[PDB]
From a paper:
We characterized the physical performance of the camera by measuring the noise power spectrum (NPS), modulation transfer function (MTF), and detective quantum efficiency (DQE). These results were extended by testing the performance of the camera for single particle cryo-EM by collecting data on two common test samples, the 481 kDa apoferritin and 149 kDa aldolase. Finally high-resolution apoferritin and aldolase datasets were collected and reconstructed to 1.66 Å and 2.24 Å respectively.
Greater than 850 micrographs were collected at each condition resulting in 183,110 particles for the 15 detected eps data, 251,816 for 30 eps, and 203,117 particles for 60 eps. These were processed identically in Relion and resulted in reconstructions at 1.68 Å, 1.68 Å, and 1.87 Å respectively. The ice-optimized map had clear evidence of the Zn2+ atom, similar to other high resolution cryo-EM apoferritin reconstructions, whereas it was absent in the earlier 15 detected eps map. In the absence of the ion, one of the liganded waters moves 0.5 Å away from the Zn2+ binding site, and the other liganded water is no longer present in the binding site. These lead to changes in the positions of multiple surrounding waters. There are no other observable changes in the peptide backbone.
Residue numbers in the entry:
A (entry chain B), B (entry chain A), C (entry chain K), D (entry chain O): 5 to 176
């Protein structure tokens, strides 16, 4: 195969391609969320900024996996990026809950990739995932859980001032 | 006894050892509180920061008493640091009320130590307690009482925005 | 369980709580050592400074494990912090030997925690331990072994100038 | 009496005059020690510097008591400053032991003055002594005890390198 390839299983290559698609999908979901909060009938600018940042971060995760694939002598095969499950995200609280669910699903995929790398005795790939993916995901999940907790306590979405003040104080 | 020891009663030495343990216990209680507010289902970062600061301050108080004990030629005897009375502190308001109670109990211990030093005609120890402990405790107690008053007025813990906004404005 | 919890075994949670207690215990042992060297009949200020630094570092290790526990959605349960095995540490050499023994016991606990995380297929926890605990412990153990070697060669504790000059040159 | 005098007992005035003389005597003892270490057959420049500093500090203590006496409307009555008990201080260790004894005797005098001020219900004088005299004395006594401990451990005065190296490392 590639002149650089060493200790890199075909299964791992395939799993990395899958993960690239999942990170691109996550970026697209975040972009959809960001847009929602930019609507004139929603109008929460710091929610919009928060989710646009997350969109840009997930793209960066995807690009770093592409760099890995080429560094190890695998070949990138792209697939369609599916549209998000919804256009209307209903509320700041609902979007944060949906983001938490998404981040946990991405984490689960990364844990399955680490298990595969461990099985195939690929320590460079195991180390890569941990170093750049697993601690970031744990941090993200904890931050989103904290946001959900705060919004729920404040009375969102029925208490009208809750998302407004959360947008100002936590996300601003 | 020690070559430096002068006008330092065995009772006072024993009472200082007790006070060291109480300050270490207080530090541990504050650490427990700090952690509680860091939970994903509580998620009040400025409450967590406030109590972690208090934990570090109480350790410093303990270390300053250790320095005193050696300066006067007493001998430090450490004891177990008991675990705090609870793991779940329930709410920002409840933690502030528990902190107020703790600070008053530490103050009471310091007043008993001052009375002992006065009885044993130990002016250096009397002056030390006042200079570094008694005004700090009065300031701490007043600050915690002010926090409790504000949280109660705002409607905590039942009014969901109260602890959130107090965390932002008073503790942030 | 917690909304953030994912791939985090109850065994691992329990083992982290145990490790928190061990790091707090180590901090307390170091504090005891620090105090000893501050006595008027011992009077080795740089030994005192060295062990006080180690005390503060072990507390920081404990606080970082608390942060991990909450990040993963576990719950911190604190226990009593037992008093150190002795009040009188006898000599600079004996304290360094006792510190070496303590650091090796903490390392052994961390290796058992890593083995548990490996068994439960928890790569985030495995990576955390290594990244922040295992290399620090190896460095600490090597430094303490070097100190013990030097003090022994110099003739401590029977050669009276040995601890004095080591305090000045190595620890100063 | 003086137009400024208020709540200032004749006993206290007399005791302050005595304390002035004792601080001037202590300054003179330190000056004698300083000179000794400047002899060509002793030649320990940092011991000489240390005791000259102490001499200048004790003079400053005396001058501050003179300022107090006039601030309270007492009248300063000076007495002869007796010569020190010896001209030859024998060794660095012996001079430090003699200094420790002197500092403890000055502390004892200050504690007797505080007891008198307490008896005569003179809180300004009690506070003055503590604020500027009692903590300084405790610090001085602890420092001298530490020096004596270190010199003894190092083998002074029989181990010829002990005072030389202490002069370099501790006092330099
Ligand atoms: Fe506001």
């Amino acid at each position: 195969p590639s002149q650089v390839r060493q200790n890199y299983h075909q299964d791992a290559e395939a799993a990395i391609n899958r993960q690239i698609n999942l990170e691109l999908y996550a970026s697209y979901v975040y972009l959809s969320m960001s847009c929602y909060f930019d609507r004139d009938d929603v109008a929460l600018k710091n929610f919009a900024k928060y989710f646009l940042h997350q969109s840009h971060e997930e793209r960066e995760h995807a690009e770093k996996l592409m760099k890995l694939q080429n560094q190890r002598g695998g070949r990138i095969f792209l697939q369609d990026i599916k549209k998000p499950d919804r256009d209307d995200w209903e509320s700041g609280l609902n979007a944060m809950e949906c983001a938490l669910h998404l981040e946990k699903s991405v984490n689960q995929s990364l844990l399955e990739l680490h298990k595969l790398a461990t099985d195939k005795n690929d320590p460079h790939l195991c180390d890569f995932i941990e170093t750049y993916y697993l601690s970031e995901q744990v941090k993200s999940i904890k931050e989103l859980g904290d946001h959900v907790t705060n919004l729920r306590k404040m009375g969102a979405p029925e208490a009208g001032m809750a998302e407004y003040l959360f947008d100002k104080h936590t996300l601003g």
